């Protein structure tokens, strides 16, 4: 749910620029060869946010 002063793909863009920790990342596989049809908890870090 969005009702902001900012549009949507705008905020998805800015979220795409956000720095994460990936120190442990090589035991996480690539998305396009991970053994799930659309996302599960083998290859995702699901952020749900609602401020």
């Amino acid at each position: 749910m969005n009702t902001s002063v900012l549009a949507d793909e705008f905020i998805s863009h800015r979220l795409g620029l956000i720095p994460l920790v990936s120190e442990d990342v090589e035991e996480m596989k690539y998305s396009r060869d991970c053994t799930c049809e659309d996302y599960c908890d083998e290859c995702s870090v699901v952020l749900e946010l609602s401020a």
Binding site: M1, N2, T3, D8, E9, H13, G16
Partner: protein, 45 residues
Amino acid sequence: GVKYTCGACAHNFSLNKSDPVRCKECGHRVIYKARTKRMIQFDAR
């Protein structure tokens, strides 16, 4: 059935394709639909 959002008092009121379309609180005649029940998607690039 649709939440027609009021343009003035933010009231979620559905109209039965029959009601004259105004604000129930001040006569403000502007409505808009609200967002769907679906989930929107984006690829964040």
